[PDB]
Amino acid sequence: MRSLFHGKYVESFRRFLNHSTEHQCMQEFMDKKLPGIIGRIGDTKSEIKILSIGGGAGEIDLQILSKVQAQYPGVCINNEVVEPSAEQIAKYKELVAKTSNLENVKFAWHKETSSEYQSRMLEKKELQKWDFIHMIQMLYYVKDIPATLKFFHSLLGTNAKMLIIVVSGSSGWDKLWKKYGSRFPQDDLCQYITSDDLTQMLDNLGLKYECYDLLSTMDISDCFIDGNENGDLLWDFLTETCNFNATAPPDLRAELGKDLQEPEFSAKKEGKVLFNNTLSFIVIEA
């Protein structure tokens, strides 16, 4: 039972992406919801400051940027990215150099974690203000979430908004983690969190937010067959384990095999087993 954490991770992650509607789900939220969300973040401003936490390869960031530009044509935008992976940054830069209509947008990449960024910003004398801050699918890697939430919320300017996206409390992950979390290998780099944990922390912090869920799925049909390589790749992903099927206790595996087909974990339709990958979109007000 080795923690999926790194060449196997990318391979499993990739498998996850091409077998789920995660990409499409996000894109759908951007088209239908994002406009309404960022509708007034640029009001009275001659420059819009966007802070991307864990921006990764930049696909979602550029989609976000397109909506802001559409809402505020002619307005300069400063899009700063906090990302610890040099590899991700390289991809992000490659994408930018490839995209065309980005004249009024300037980028800056800071190779560090949100925590390092936070302490670095606290060494400065006064904290900057941002019009839009987003943390997409990255809170799992933050050690102190309440401090992180409080800090970034304090960086929001007038009418600014903070967008956070993590899996939903009503997704299969939530159930998978609550029940088998302790039986999966642990890595000090990742912790299980869902919108339930998040809204609870936001409630205790006393911050105002709205939470929207968007159904997304992961086709894990291939997970039900000895040998199938893709199924095994997905097995590894769902368990954050390297070669789950070959190293995990048979009692664990067997039990998992059963639960993954239960209504609360997946839906069965068209002879397919679709793991509930519902995502939660949380918008926090300044």
Ligand SMILES: Nc1ncnc2c1ncn2[C@@H]1O[C@H](CSCC[C@H](N)C(=O)O)[C@@H](O)[C@H]1O
């Ligand atoms: N503590 C931390 N602070 C900021 N970013 C972090 C981090 N730990 C990991 N990350 C970054 O978090 C990202 C998680 S993948 C997140 C998805 C990405 N926002 C996009 O939508 O594609 C990766 O780029 C990873 O390097």
Ligand SMILES: NCCc1c[nH]cn1
């Ligand atoms: N759909 C979210 C993918 C993910 C990241 N970590 C765990 N699961």
